[PDB]
């Protein structure tokens, strides 16, 4: 059941749930988005095909020709990823498009063809995403983090009564296009509907309503119900629907059909409407006072004179009624109004409206959009028609149309991309329906309204924004005539496309630098969900509510991984199993539950669909038949956990650990910590430096393997086989016979990335973790990357911790540290820095890199070569010279102050046209020899592979083993064999060998043309030299090392080995923490992790003792069997009966440092299993042992907790922080010291830090602090002379930065001066 590579060391998995779904590829969001970007789309919906079908074909203005599009094809990259990484250039693909230009005939009518031309034409370098998810843009690996923005659609909202000083709520509605102009509707506090476009000046909505070819009668038809008034001979028989009567007041004798139904003084009850509808009454005799102030619908003009009697939307009076009844009108149409359910909000907005016809509406709109610019008739209709209703300047994507129809309770998922009349009518209809009382508004933090915009979509939008410019230029020049001899390379220009791609991938708002000091840090940076960016909010303009977790977040967005500080919860991270949708919403997987049994089919439920069903909790006890063993089980229905029945559920959770991110699910015993302190731990985990020797975590969570393989740091086998050659630098895998391809048979080679510079100055290396001649399966790790151990994530070390307060050396949060941990050389870390020296062009000419530097002796030049560059491998310290340089009159590079190191690589680049020195030719020639060595070694190892394949297919059908070697390996065809399809296989192999013969003779010279070429540089510089220094920063007081549950602490004393607390067996504790930080910061997870680590190394010491004295494999087999057993119905169940008795010994060597234990996140190892595991060991089951002091030697009463806690060394080293300055250089405009540590800068005595000196009696200290020590330039030199002359006395003066103030006030029209 277990693979050969996982028999090397098998982690003991606790936990009880069966996994129904493996954790997916952890980087799948980035890879899927970019493979929707660059991949040929036949249907034409995704990628460059979508943008090209949007823009192309482009017509001309005259229309005598047009440019269409055929296909696109990415060129082969000119360099691969690591050569682009070294050189400092984009890892880019040329885009080659088959454009096609027609020519029509002029005198022939619209649509005829003179000629049509076609070619493959290039436009723009697009960066390709690397194999992992990173873009190499300028040698800095950058990741485009996903965005989380407002899903386009229509969003109803209400500012909850905190405006207008009233407590009245003001509902509003945004029509948010994907690309185009927003549209807002809102209610006035006085119930007037208003519109605004793009948050400009507010207008009533009737202007945009009349601008859609509408008049007032049509509007009052649209928004309103009709009430019929029939003047007859007897007192206004009015047609009344009884449903309009409910909740209303009686105002007269409601008597009809000869029956008194309702007296006045009644509210119209249910039974009165009931008796009107059983009595079927449609008309009521009403008095004419019922038209006290009601409104007529339409125009009424006279039948004989033909003159206006009453206008549409006019409040009728009794004289007006007399004029209507005297003109032969019988039907009087009135708008039904109501206090609650039918507000007449449209009518008063027609009253506010100063427009009566359509041109007035268009003139108002054209004024409102562009003030000034005296309006013309054609410009207003053109502006309003391309503002919303053109396919170019407005666009609600498919996502926008989905949300737009799903909001309004329509049915269709698709429709017009642009707005239509019916859409805007529906927006007003639904908004007034909300204002009436039915319907409901949204909450904006709901993940049904927020949408993931990943790297493919943003880059496609930027590419389209570029493409709009180049089609405009093409349209211009194509509309310019005499097209007859023209080709589509001069109409299209690649510079706007390359600009609009290069700007976004190079320097954007969400194109950020890779956090690359772990595998974990980069894999949690490629999954990051930023709410910032264009189209989203900002850090200082974000309220309390968007930062908060919405209950929709369960399973989509992790709630406990979040940066602290100014942006809480804008930089959310994805959950583990979470996926992006087809459209972009965040969907999470769920098991489908049938009538009573939890099945194993899973559906990836979206955000809106989560509310409609009801879904079980992650840990609901089901037992061997899918039955919930209880009747009252905990579920969530609509954002609310409650005890529901056994038989109401719809879905089950896929796993216990689907709530948390991948950065947080590595935390063991996460179900015991706080959430504040677990936030600090899971955010803190991403900064663990890769140590010297990666050591596995004793208490992991089983996600260690998934992170270490899904990150692209471990070299993983592509096809299984037998390893044939392991070096320290390359891996040779002979492929197995079933996995071997017929064409291009070969073998596999991996080149391991040695000691190069990760992006934040740490080393990455790949050590091979396989020895020679071993069976490897597909998907197996072969080379451990930085801070990984045998293909599982191992960020720090795992060491013996005793929770006692120790003599105040661990007072607040500090960490007393034994000197064994630095003696064992297990926290000392490599840091690889890069120092570059330019060769500028200046006045008095260029300067040299020669060794002849003025005023230096052989002490300075004792390490340099003749050509000015230090030897590779020379150890230097601070203040040395790595590169000599001069000024035409000493501008040499120096090692910065304080650092040490070994120079491990020197790269020289020279611009083309400048002679290269002997050093550059020396580097070039070992480069050329090494490249020839690489290509020839690949050729001859692959020749060994081909000849081994040939000898393998010469074992039958003409076997003469001697005749194989009578003639050498070159001619292994013309020996004896039967000419069948076997000989066709040998003939395929022979042409493959001759193909490699061609490939070598061209690839070596292509590599020569790449190496010998003096590269491009900045304009002005001749040659750049980049040395790489490497240091081993060990450990000291001052560093910050932490745990996994956020007990950060500054290591405070490297205590000698003797003084440390030691147990009765004599082993001295490596780290003595502080117990005081546990009861406040509620991280009991660190105490359980300490206990479990102690149990794990108890089993480790038992196996090590059992192996030290020699004992047989039968003892090891039964003991390791008992150790991997003993769970309280755990799921692992590993069987040592099938292990072939070297794999037990191979496993027992790997367990001699302690058995790894896996504790899944919310399916944890309980305390009882820990007690059983400790009892299996020879350790006390309370966890706490008796330590003796190192100094007194006496017993600490109240015996203390020890164990093995997994400690990380964080990347805030004290040698990167410690800083001092007496006097250096000064700033230019203000004569103050500069800031920062890169410039030799002094600190900032700030405003709050001056109030502390005013708050004392201290003044002369303050006076020297902001005059003499900083800015009084006459006084700070005299001070320096006064100390060196041994006289501490100040000349205070007047600070020059006050004179700067005087000039910048006086430079206005303001006189300011000083008096007597």
């Amino acid at each position: 059941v277990y693979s050969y590579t996982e028999k090397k060391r098998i982690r003991k998995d606790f936990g009880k749930r069966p996994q129904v779904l493996d954790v997916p590829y952890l980087l799948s969001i980035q890879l899927d988005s970019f493979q929707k970007f660059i991949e040929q789309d036949p249907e034409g919906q995704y990628g460059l095909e979508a943008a090209f079908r949007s823009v192309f074909p482009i017509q001309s203005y005259s229309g005598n020709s047009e440019l269409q599009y055929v296909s696109y094809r990415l060129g082969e990259p000119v360099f691969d990823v690591q050569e682009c990484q070294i050189r400092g250039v984009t890892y880019s693909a040329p885009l080659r498009v088959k454009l096609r230009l027609v020519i029509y005939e002029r005198e022939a009518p619209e649509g005829t063809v003179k000629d049509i031309k076609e070619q493959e034409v290039y436009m723009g370098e697009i960066p390709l995403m690397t194999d992992n998810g990173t873009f190499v843009i300028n040698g800095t690996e950058r990741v485009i983090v996903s965005q989380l923005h407002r899903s386009p659609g229509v969003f109803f909202d209400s500012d909850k009564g905190k405006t207008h000083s009233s407590g009245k709520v003001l509902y509003n509605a945004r029509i948010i296009p994907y690309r185009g102009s927003w549209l807002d509707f809102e209610f006035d506090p006085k119930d007037n509907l208003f519109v605004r476009i793009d948050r400009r000046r507010k207008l009533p909505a009737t202007i945009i309503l009349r601008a859609l070819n509408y008049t007032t009668e049509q509007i009052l038809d649209l928004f309103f119900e009709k009430v019929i008034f029939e003047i007859r001979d007897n007192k206004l028989q009015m047609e009344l629907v009884p449903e309009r009567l409910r909740g209303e007041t009686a105002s007269f004798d409601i008597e009809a059909n000869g029956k008194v139904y309702v007296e006045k003084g009644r509210r119209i009850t249910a039974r009165h409407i009931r008796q009107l509808e059983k009595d079927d009454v449609k008309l009521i005799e009403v008095p004419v006072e019922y038209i006290a102030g009601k409104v007529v619908a339409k125009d009424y003009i006279d039948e004989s004179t033909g003159e206006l009697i009453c206008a549409a939307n006019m409040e009728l009076s009794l004289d007006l009624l007399a004029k209507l009844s005297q003109s032969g009108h019988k039907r009087i149409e009135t708008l039904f109004t109501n206090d609650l359910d039918h507000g007449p909000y449209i009518s008063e907005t027609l009253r506010v409206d100063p427009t009566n016809d359509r041109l007035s509406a268009l003139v108002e709109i054209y004024r409102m959009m562009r003030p000034g610019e005296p309006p013309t008739r054609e410009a207003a209709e053109s502006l309003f028609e391309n503002l919303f209703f053109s396919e170019d300047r407005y666009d609600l994507s498919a996502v926008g149309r989905m949300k737009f129809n799903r909001s309004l309770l329509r049915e269709e998922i698709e429709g017009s991309g642009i707005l239509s009349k019916d859409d805007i009518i529906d927006v007003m209809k639904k908004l007034i329906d909300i204002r009436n009382g039915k319907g409901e508004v949204d909450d904006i933090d709901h993940l049904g309204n927020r949408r993931i915009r990943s790297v493919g979509e943003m880059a496609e939008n930027q590419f389209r924004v570029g493409l709009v410019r180049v089609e405009r230029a093409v349209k211009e020049r194509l509309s310019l005539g005499d097209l007859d001899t023209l080709m589509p390379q001069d109409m299209i220009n690649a510079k706007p496309i390359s600009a609009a791609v290069k700007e976004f991938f190079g320097s954007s708002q969400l194109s950020q630098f890779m956090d690359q000091n772990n595998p974990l840090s980069e894999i949690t940076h490629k999954r990051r969900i930023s709410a910032l960016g264009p189209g989203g909010l900002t850090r200082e303009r974000a309220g309390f509510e968007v930062r908060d977790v919405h209950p929709t977040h369960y399973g989509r967005v992790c709630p406990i991984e979040t940066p602290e500080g100014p942006n809480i919860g804008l930089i959310n991270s994805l959950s583990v199993y979470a996926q992006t949708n087809e459209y972009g919403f965040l969907e999470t997987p769920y098991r489908k539950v049938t009538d009573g049994v939890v099945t194993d089919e899973i559906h990836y439920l979206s955000a809106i669909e989560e509310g409609n069903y009801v879904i079980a909790q992650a840990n609901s006890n089901l037992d061997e038949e899918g039955h919930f063993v209880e009747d009252l089980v905990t579920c969530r229905s609509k954002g609310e956990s409650s005890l529901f029945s056994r038989d109401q559920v719809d879905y089950m959770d896929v796993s216990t650990q689907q709530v948390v991110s991948v950065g947080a699910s590595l935390i063991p015993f996460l179900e015991h910590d706080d959430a504040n302190r677990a936030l600090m731990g899971a955010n803190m985990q991403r900064q663990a430096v890769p140590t010297l020797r990666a050591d596995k975590p004793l208490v992991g969570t089983g996600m260690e393997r998934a992170v270490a393989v899904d990150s692209g740091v471990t070299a993983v086998a592509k096809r299984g086989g037998v390893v044939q050659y392991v070096d320290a630098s390359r891996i040779v895998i002979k492929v197995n016979e079933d996995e071997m391809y017929p064409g291009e048979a070969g073998i596999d080679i991996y080149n391991l990335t040695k000691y190069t510079r990760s992006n934040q100055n740490t080393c990455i290396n790949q050590m091979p973790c396989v020895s020679l001649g071993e069976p490897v399966e597909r998907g197996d790790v072969l080379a451990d990357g930085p801070s990984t151990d045998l293909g599982e994530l191992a960020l720090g070390q795992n060491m013996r911790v005793a929770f006692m307060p120790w003599n105040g050396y661990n007072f607040e949060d500090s960490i007393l540290v034994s000197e064994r941990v630095v003696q064992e050389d297990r926290f000392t870390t490599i840091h690889i820095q890069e120092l570059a020296c330019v060769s500028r062009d200046t006045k008095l000419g260029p300067e040299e890199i020669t060794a002849d530097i003025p005023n230096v002796g052989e002490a300075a030049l004792s390490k340099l070569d003749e050509s000015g560059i230090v030897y590779i491998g020379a150890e230097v310290t601070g203040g040395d010279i790595l590169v000599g340089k001069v000024t035409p009159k000493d501008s040499s590079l120096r090692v910065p102050n304080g650092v040490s190191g070994t120079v491990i690589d020197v790269q020289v680049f020279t611009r083309d046209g400048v002679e290269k020195d002997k050093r550059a030719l020396e580097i070039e020639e070992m480069q050329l020899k090494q490249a020839k060595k690489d290509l020839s070694e690949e050729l001859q190892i692959l020749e060994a592979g081909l000849f081994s394949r040939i000898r393998a297919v010469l074992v039958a059908g003409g076997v003469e083993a001697e005749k194989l070697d009578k003639l050498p390996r070159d001619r292994w065809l013309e020996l004896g064999l039967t000419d069948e399809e076997k000989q066709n296989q040998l003939e395929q192999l022979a042409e493959q060998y001759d193909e490699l013969k061609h490939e070598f003779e061209k690839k070596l010279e292509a590599k020569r043309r790449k190496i010998t070429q003096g590269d491009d540089l900045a304009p002005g510089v001749l040659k750049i030299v980049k040395v790489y220094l490497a240091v081993k920063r060990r450990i000291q007081p001052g560093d910050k090392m932490a745990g996994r549950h956020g007990n950060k602490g500054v290591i405070s004393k490297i205590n000698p080995i003797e003084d440390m607390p030691y147990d009765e067996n004599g082993t001295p504790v490596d780290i003595v923490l502080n117990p005081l930080g546990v009861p406040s910061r509620m991280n009991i997870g660190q105490i359980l992790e300490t206990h479990l680590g102690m149990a794990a190394k108890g089993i480790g010491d038992k196996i090590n003792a059992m192996l030290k004295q020699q004992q047989e494999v039968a003892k090891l087999r039964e003991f390791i069997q008992r150790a991997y057993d003993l769970g309280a119905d755990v799921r692992q169940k590993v069987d040592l009966s099938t292990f072939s008795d070297e794999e037990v010994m191979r496993l027992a060597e790997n367990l001699r440092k302690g058995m790894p234990i896996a504790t899944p996140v919310f399916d944890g190892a309980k305390e009882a299993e820990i007690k059983e595991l400790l009892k299996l060991g020879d350790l006390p089951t309370s966890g706490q042992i008796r330590l003796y002091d190192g100094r007194t030697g006496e017993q600490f009463e109240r015996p203390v907790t020890v164990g093995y806690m997994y400690m990380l060394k964080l990347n805030h080293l004290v040698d990167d922080k410690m800083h001092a300055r007496s006097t250096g250089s000064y700033s230019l405009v203000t004569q103050q010291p500069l800031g920062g540590k890169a410039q030799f800068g002094g600190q900032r005595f700030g405003e709050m830090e001056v109030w502390a000196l005013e708050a004392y009696g201290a003044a002369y200290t303050l006076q020297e602090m902001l005059t003499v020590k900083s800015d009084d330039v006459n006084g700070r030199t005299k001070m320096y002379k006064n100390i060196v002359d041994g006289n501490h006395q100040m000349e205070p003066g007047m600070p020059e930065s006050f004179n700067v103030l005087l000039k910048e006030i006086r430079s206005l029209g303001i006189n300011i001066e000083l008096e007597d």
Binding site: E66, V102, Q119
Partner: protein, 50 residues
């Protein structure tokens, strides 16, 4: 051709730049007159002077 399917004659030039011509306009097409039917040159169609 923008909603009108037409039959054209693809004549390839130098730098494999294709050229499709209408079948109705067939009298703008002639055979080679240089007599180098196996060794005729290949014009750059548009022009190399750009």
């Amino acid at each position: 051709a923008g909603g009108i399917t037409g039959e054209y004659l693809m004549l390839t030039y130098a730098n494999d730049a294709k050229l499709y011509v209408p079948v109705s306009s067939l009298h703008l097409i002639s055979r080679y007159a240089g007599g180098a039917e196996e060794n005729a040159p290949l014009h750059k169609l548009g022009g190399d002077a750009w």
